[PDB]
Amino acid sequence: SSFSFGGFTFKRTSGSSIKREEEVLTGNLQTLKIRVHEGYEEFTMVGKRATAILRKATRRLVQLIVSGKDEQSIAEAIIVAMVFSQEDCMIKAVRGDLNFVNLNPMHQLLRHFQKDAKVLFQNWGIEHIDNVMGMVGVLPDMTPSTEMSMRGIRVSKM
Numbered sequence: 001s002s003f004s005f006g007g008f009t010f011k012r013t014s015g016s017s018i019k020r021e022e023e024v025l026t027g028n029l030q031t032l033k034i035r036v037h038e039g040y041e042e043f044t045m046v047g048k049r050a051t052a053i054l055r056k057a058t059r060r061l062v063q064l065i066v067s068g069k070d071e072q073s074i075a076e077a078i079i080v081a082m083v084f085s086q087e088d089c090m091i092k093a094v095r096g097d098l099n100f101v102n103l104n105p106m107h108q109l110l111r112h113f114q115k116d117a118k119v120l121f122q123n124w125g126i127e128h129i130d131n132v133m134g135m136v137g138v139l140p141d142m143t144p145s146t147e148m149s150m151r152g153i154r155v156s157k158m
């Protein structure tokens with residue numbers, strides 16, 4: 001039950017989901033039809049330069065604990081996780097001139113945020129983090145922080 005998305009192998013740990021073909025509205029008010037997965041699932045993301053534990057619900061990321069080679073490798077894994085979550089704020093982060101989508105829309109969403117994750121990370125939201133050791137918060141500019149992180153995202157040492 002393993003699959004590939006954005007260079008990462010995905011394996012389901014726990015949970016289940018059914019698919020619903022659904023219409024979503026971008027920040028540019030454009031209609032995309034995506035195959036939404038309903039239900040709470042846990043995944044391990046395995047890539048060549050990053051690994052992650054992804055806890056998600058229907059169109060909502062619950063938690064992402066990401067480990068990797070450096071900031072860039074980790075950012076790549078966070079981008080895939082946020083696109084994979086199917087969250088409204090990731091879809092609403094598709095905005096502005098030429099930013100349009102033409103055939104799988106999930107792969108288009110990824111290409112878009114791979115080019116520039118600034119609006120995605122900044123529009124995702126930030127939260128206060130209870131102190132933990134060996135786990136750190138990460139800001140939308142990919143700066144480590146003990147005080148705050150992007151909603152549900154934690155960075156763990158390799």
Ligand SMILES: O=C(O)[C@H]1[C@H]2CC[C@H](CC2)[C@@H]1Nc1nc(-c2c[nH]c3ncc(F)cc23)ncc1F
Pocket residue numbers: 003004005017035037041083084085086104106107
């Ligand atoms: O739905 C699809 O067409 C594809 C493309 C876009 C992301 C996955 C990899 C390619 C997706 N394929 C698969 N997704 C899933 C899957 C389970 N939970 C999910 N939550 C969000 C999501 F997005 C995909 C999934 N399971 C098996 C798959 F095989």
